[model samples]
Target: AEPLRRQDVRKTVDKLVEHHIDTQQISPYILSRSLEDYVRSFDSHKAYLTQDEVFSHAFSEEATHPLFKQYQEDNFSSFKELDTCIQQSISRAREWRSSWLTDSIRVIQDAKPSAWASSIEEVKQRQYDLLLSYASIYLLCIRQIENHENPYIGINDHGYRMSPEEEANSFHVRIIKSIAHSLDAHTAYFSQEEALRVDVSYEPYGNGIIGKITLHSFYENQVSSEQDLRKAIRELQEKNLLGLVLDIRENTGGFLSQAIKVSGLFLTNGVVVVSRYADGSVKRYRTISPQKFYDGPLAVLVSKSSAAAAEIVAQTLQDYGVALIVGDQQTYGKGTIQHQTDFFKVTVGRYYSPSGKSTQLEGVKSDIVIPSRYAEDKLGERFLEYALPADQYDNVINDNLGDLDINIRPWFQKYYSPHLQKPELVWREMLPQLAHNSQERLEKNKNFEIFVQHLKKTNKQDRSFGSNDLQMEESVNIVKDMILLKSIS
Candidate 1:
């Protein structure tokens, strides 16, 4: 068992070293500190192990150096003791849960304590408190089962996942994941079982002439996004839809393939995103369709929560000068692309827009900015622990004109070039006036004032005033402005 485990670990590490974009340059010192992350990854939310347990196991630099060195030499025996310690600590936590104190579960549920428990008694108290929360969830699950409703609610917190015995026993699996995490934020390990654990709503706004499509996240839907979006646009066209607002403010991301197809809906032809790898190889993701479905005035709404594939679609359309961006100052700025194998996912390349700018640290900036609550929060990829630095590719704006493939030029000339003939009529140049109009409207709206006031307050007590969705309403206003500005341009 131990020999097979060592073989698996070595193969995993070697694959990462061979393919991960930044793995070759990771400092030995930083690699040694992976031991700290490996231990803490198990109890990241401070649920299972106490501070003393983590410190006792993780903080010894002398012990970590030898283990990391042995790991480099293909000897994984160094991890055995550490793995035993983690297992023992988790088993102890389970035992502690059996011995509990009567604390009001509701009161304890408000917020996690400021620090991890430093003593056994404190650890037990925390466990008992968390146990009550789980008990409540279990009670709800039972009622849901009785009522014949779906009771399969997954806990979102990392610590919540560690409660399962089998997950705790998979200490070896986590070690590989931690090592991948140390290389870069995106590289990760996912077990076969773990990997399995991984909406477009459009409505008519303002006089039923401007339609807004809000996609919370890009996931594999039973119906393809292109079909769903096309269906929505067709329905909106019935009411004389003039402009469209594609709202992806809180979209964290999903399938890259879906992003390519979605972005292509607005674009006629050409590359959507360029992936530049470490070996100087490049891969261009092209539009799934060669025809534009909706080529009218378009505005994309984005925020700090909009990330990855969502950023890809927004930046792609922005680079093509086909859509006006409206929302936060920029997007979530996650530029790296990952490749998933059997049980591991490695960061293979950096994503560049059609204009050749990497969406790494600098996300796609809005042409008209409307600040959201997420803008102030530490939410972008830069706020993460080991995010890759931003860089750029050679300007490839011509790629949008099919400069890479000459055969597509005729198609471009027929379908896309005519639109560019009247560049002055494009909505991007009207950003100044549109921005001015949006600001003036936002300044005087009472609901907007209340929303801004609520944003500034730390004590979040309800003021008994119902505030309209000022950001979204402002986005629709920007779209309307784009329509009016373009009608006569």
Candidate 2:
């Protein structure tokens, strides 16, 4: 039998209970699911069970406290009383603070002497007492706002999200910038409009023969089943070109079913990927249709920003030995899938590829690593606060891929791309030869030199504008090399 995990030796169980209390995932409350359902309006997990009964009650009523109704009625109701009070300097400050204290009493309690305050000098260091109260009030205010209403650390669309009057007095917005400072780089509060954007785009890559498909996002119920991808494959067969480069760079994820749809765009009806849940059961997402649109030599372009849905597509293709992943670094490692409950965000499950490599916290390792500022260690999901363990489920089915109805590995040697031999820093050795042959192709071209210099001087982001076409140019040429090599063979 396994030994019981000990909390006694480390410290007291009393402190441990409150400090790392495992209240667990969101549960349905009276109005919402969990207390912290209110928090995400400001939000992950042991999957930290976020519950605060007092916080949810205040949010539901927008009352802040039980005392606010009576306090407001007494202090600011009469126009004559308001006018007389307004004559004083910063007159509203103390009244507002008093009103706030009245409301916050039941919400959050601290070691303060009493709630009532005055302009007269206090016996108990008036400023000190008031400051502590102010801090406690603002602290809960910022947290509730950060957790319940807004988590993203930028300016929001007021017309839709918040009203003008509320925005002015709203503590939720006031401390967001202060709170957002410590949030995970990839963990963001999203905006509304981009929900329905370009799911996939196909265009000419090198010599108009090979194509480029930029899948911006794997949106659910995509508008284009237009099946233009099938036509593109037909066009590729006619052009005798290599294949398309599927670029999911900077793609923040979307729905899981949509990931399945995006994966099928590249491969046919086959075992696309596998998913492992917390319950120890697994599910395989096979392609919906048996007809793969593109079957030629393919390469996938990923980056630090290529996240959940992107990882699902990229890793599945990489696992099937169908496409070589090229990135500035490894893919964004987000394996666990989350579900937004009424009150908490629950960690539902995780994803695995054909080889059983979980793309959770570790993301996908690129076949060819390149130089991109975004792929730096500080940028991806691995170091995120409370990041999940990068678990492996090493069960390779590709061992017998030859017997499968659809297999992409047998065609690899025909392409003979050097990266196929081994995933490298970049694609090839003679890649530099192209630069010397043609007009200066690679270098710190298009503010690349500035970006490098900027990183050296300060911690500011890369703001230099213009086209950084070097990576894309090189990737396309690499695909062209596949077409050329196969053509010569």
Candidate 3:
């Protein structure tokens, strides 16, 4: 049967049909629509179910049983109607099965799944239905896509078939992301073209350098050696460029290990972050850098999109008071430890900083918040429902050199003058003067002044770079102020 199969696609499918019919895991009707959804679950968006009226279009999946519990509470009778509609749709699908779907489901007159529609059974059934549906889609879709127009019986293709002309459509980027979108918003696969480019750009700025770094993701292998970041910093230091602005604005995030290596570039090696597993185990990460290269005045530029490993870098540098975090109101609070399987990804742990603060919703708060001209206007993690709390721990950082952790005092003491606060603090002290330096610039830019007013009125902003944008202009100015203040002190 394996080499030249003629046996029981029907036997197994009907047996599966019978099994779900007998078991309350998911009713057969729920099972059927969910089977169709299995191959199509990649198309679900907005995180779980964000709707009600048309929600069952995708929300009716057997995998969605628990959500049906919540849905059931809200829908006393309409929930039952959902399964009936699912059966009717599948029965109609049997009449004209989609090229995407293989075997269309039948509605038995004697044993209908609507019978399993008890308040509790529907929820339980939904779970099993989803798993079965997932399996059904996984196997059948591969067969349909691979075999194409072979006389092999169709599993489910929504009645359409892939022709040779449609070959490229099968591998299109959106279709790839269709698979990715099914997982989590952050989880995705990059094309080879997307993966090939990893460059860190460094610019000379008034006896300093501005570094542009993008953290694409934390999938481990995707993170580069950061050799350029290291080399540029070393080169800048050799040139006596004592100040730097490391921009991580659009950086999405990547493996946590990359953050340690990247964080190592500036700091003497030490504990960088702590993560706890779902089952109550804890993991602590230390910097991989053996020696600090350049610990002088540093500023990290970030925005709402700067997340995961990028935020990790920002948070760590902020905790050490090693870098002044300058960005939007906050960084993206994508602060969950996620574990992924072939099927889907699940959040497995909570992220904690080395200084013992949760970085979940409350991402690294910048010392000086600046609205970037090009950053997206979307809300941070707190905007989402079921978002983990950002209020769990008080932030454990002070740019003013006020809150001293007894543990990190030595690193500050041994290398630079322990007596002097990190130049970032002096940079903070000089913000007034720095802004004063740009006072004339700010006064002249009417558009920036209006933008500043809108920032005060509403917490949301999307901006395009003005030649006179005050936020980054001040950031560049503050970097100069750090160099100037460091020399005077």
Give model 1 RMSD, 1 decimal: 7.0
For candidate 1, the per-residue lDDT at 305 reads 83
- Candidate 2 C-alpha error for residue 459, in Å: 14
* Candidate models: Cα lDDT each: 0.68, 0.47, 0.51
For every model shown, what is its TM-score relative to the native structure? 0.74, 0.51, 0.54
Task: Identify the runs in model 2 with alpha carbons over 4 angstroms from their true place.
Answer: 1-208, 221-241, 285-291, 394-468
RMSD of each: 7.0, 15.6, 14.0
In order of TM-score, best first, we have: 1, 3, 2
Residue 438 lDDT (model 3): 54
Specify the highest-lDDT model's number.
1
Question: How many pairs of residues collide in each model?
Answer: 0, 19, 29
Model 3 TM: 0.54
Tens digits of per-residue lDDT for model 2, 362-473:
7888766544557334666776644556777655443333333455655432332222212222223333443343224334354655544554655266476366554555
Model 3, which residues run further than 4 Å from truth? Answer: 1-158, 161-225, 281-291, 373-376, 391-474
Candidate 3, 284-310: lDDT as tens digits = 334333456666777787888788778
- Candidate 1 lDDT, 303-388, residue by residue in tens: 98889889999988887788888898988889998887746778888888867888889988888888888755677888776788
Count steric clashes of candidate 1.
0
lDDT of 2: 0.47
